[PDB]
Design a protein around this ligand. Sequence first.
Ligand SMILES: [Zn+2]
Ligand SMILES: [Zn+2]
Ligand SMILES: [Zn+2]
Ligand SMILES: [Zn+2]
Ligand SMILES: [Zn+2]
Ligand SMILES: [Zn+2]
Ligand SMILES: [Zn+2]
Ligand SMILES: [Zn+2]
Ligand SMILES: [Zn+2]
Ligand SMILES: [Zn+2]
Ligand SMILES: [Zn+2]
Ligand SMILES: [Zn+2]
Ligand SMILES: [Zn+2]
Lengths: 81, 82, 84, 81
Amino acid sequence: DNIHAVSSERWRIHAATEIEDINTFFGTEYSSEEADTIGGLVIQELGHLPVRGEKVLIGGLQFTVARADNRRLHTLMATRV
Amino acid sequence: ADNIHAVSSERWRIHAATEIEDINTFFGTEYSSEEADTIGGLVIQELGHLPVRGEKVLIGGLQFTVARADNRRLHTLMATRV
Amino acid sequence: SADNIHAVSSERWRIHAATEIEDINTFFGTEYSSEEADTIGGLVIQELGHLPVRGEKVLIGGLQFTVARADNRRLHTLMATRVK
Amino acid sequence: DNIHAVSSERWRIHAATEIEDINTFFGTEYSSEEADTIGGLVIQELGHLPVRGEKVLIGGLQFTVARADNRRLHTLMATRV
Ligand SMILES: [Zn+2]
Ligand SMILES: [Zn+2]
Ligand SMILES: [Zn+2]
Ligand SMILES: [Zn+2]
Ligand SMILES: [Zn+2]
Ligand SMILES: [Zn+2]
Ligand SMILES: [Zn+2]
Ligand SMILES: [Zn+2]
Ligand SMILES: [Zn+2]
Ligand SMILES: [Zn+2]
Ligand SMILES: [Zn+2]
Ligand SMILES: [Zn+2]
Ligand SMILES: [Zn+2]
């Protein structure tokens, strides 16, 4: 699973998860104009490839970077605001 | 290999064999039973019989709906918050 | 049991191959990571180079994984112990 | 499973677990001369019915009380000393 529930209000999410799938899962309306994937959306929002422990708020969800390297973002943790 | 599957952010598909303590960790609930060790066991206790698909049990601020069950086993519950 | 990582005794575990690598890491305190694998079965296949048969073993970090159930399609179950 | 691994070195144990079963799983040599369940043995070693958080070292395992009430001990967490 690309979106894994760690607990009822916390999700471990592969960066490659399609934005469409995030939107269906969460009831969000994130745009896919500038990205295909949630990792891509996070990078677009921050303007820069983030580091482990960095958090970004997008709509009503907070994404925390769980695993990233100098090349790629691989995993995010999400919770509600 | 996941026992509690989130189908959407507010809805979960749960294996009936999932241990009650693991349900409690996941949801913050405090379920207990001296007759059952699994969430399926608890649902059977509450309903007083082996249920069929569509039967519902409300406990501890969660609603469990029987998603799959036959004449021998209760397999799967769907949970939502009340 | 319903455990994806099932202790058969205090120091030996039967593990569903489909267990996510992150859930292995939480359980064991390992820091496994793959660019190309998301599950422990995937990681075993990566480290061995091929789909293994029952009885094949691989050491990854401080854990030894032996194949317990596999077929011509899939690796299903592993038995793990801590390296000595 | 009356003895469930939460993590590789921490186990959730039903208080009603027979002492013999503890011995099989851990290689302990606890005896059943008085209590014959692990919850009974914890109470016997402490000398009273414990509350959540109480710990007793028995041989090479530490048992911490995880769920108890004013009448019964239900769940223990074990770790190695
Ligand atoms: Zn998962
Ligand atoms: Zn929409
Ligand atoms: Zn990478
Ligand atoms: Zn399932
Ligand atoms: Zn239990
Ligand atoms: Zn019925
Ligand atoms: Zn069946
Ligand atoms: Zn077993
Ligand atoms: Zn994953
Ligand atoms: Zn081979
Ligand atoms: Zn278990
Ligand atoms: Zn005391
Ligand atoms: Zn009890």
